[PDB]
């Protein structure tokens, strides 16, 4: 058995949906990310209210790709006034640090049975950017991602 993920109560988990394979590569290389304005606000609130008592996990997926591509932990609050144009589009403003802890393609077919009661019970694989995942579903997603071969 693996009871690792079932045994934790302080952590928050968000879906990250990116249009750009370049931005994913840049994020892995430099351990930084930037969301939209309302996305950044959502993640910043979650990070600051955690007060380092548990992780904020980010489950990354490229829009239309059919799979998740990895997992990162958020590692700073959002700095909203930073260099413009570092991402594939110049519409994203700011920067926060992440730490990629898992880089692996996980097909949507391995996760589409997990549904989000906070998103009309839609499959977790039909989420939009910065969709939050209830902890009990997040544990199941993390276990499937960690065990996929
Ligand atoms: C870096 C970045 N941040 C985002 O919020 N979205 C929605 C993207 O597509 C992307 N490439």
UniProtKB/Swiss-Prot annotation:
<feature type="binding site">
    <location>
        <position position="87"/>
    </location>
    <ligand>
        <name>RNA</name>
    </ligand>
</feature>
<feature type="binding site">
    <location>
        <position position="63"/>
    </location>
    <ligand>
        <name>RNA</name>
    </ligand>
</feature>
<comment type="similarity">
    <text>Belongs to the YTHDF family. YTHDF2 subfamily.</text>
</comment>
<comment type="subunit">
    <text>Interacts with CNOT1; interaction is direct and promotes recruitment of the CCR4-NOT complex. Interacts with YTHDF3. Interacts with RIDA/HRSP12; interaction leads to recruitment of the ribonuclease P/MRP complex.</text>
</comment>
<feature type="binding site">
    <location>
        <position position="23"/>
    </location>
    <ligand>
        <name>RNA</name>
    </ligand>
</feature>
<feature type="region of interest" description="Interaction with m6A-containing mRNAs">
    <location>
        <begin position="9"/>
        <end position="149"/>
    </location>
</feature>
<feature type="binding site">
    <location>
        <position position="92"/>
    </location>
    <ligand>
        <name>RNA</name>
    </ligand>
</feature>
<protein>
    <recommendedName>
        <fullName>YTH domain-containing family protein 2</fullName>
    </recommendedName>
</protein>
<comment type="function">
    <text>(Microbial infection) Promotes viral gene expression and replication of polyomavirus SV40: acts by binding to N6-methyladenosine (m6A)-containing viral RNAs.</text>
</comment>
<feature type="domain" description="YTH">
    <location>
        <begin position="11"/>
        <end position="145"/>
    </location>
</feature>
<feature type="binding site">
    <location>
        <begin position="33"/>
        <end position="34"/>
    </location>
    <ligand>
        <name>RNA</name>
    </ligand>
</feature>
<comment type="function">
    <text>Specifically recognizes and binds N6-methyladenosine (m6A)-containing RNAs, and regulates their stability. M6A is a modification present at internal sites of mRNAs and some non-coding RNAs and plays a role in mRNA stability and processing. Acts as a regulator of mRNA stability by promoting degradation of m6A-containing mRNAs via interaction with the CCR4-NOT and ribonuclease P/MRP complexes, depending on the context. The YTHDF paralogs (YTHDF1, YTHDF2 and YTHDF3) share m6A-containing mRNAs targets and act redundantly to mediate mRNA degradation and cellular differentiation.</text>
</comment>
<feature type="binding site">
    <location>
        <begin position="17"/>
        <end position="19"/>
    </location>
    <ligand>
        <name>RNA</name>
    </ligand>
</feature>
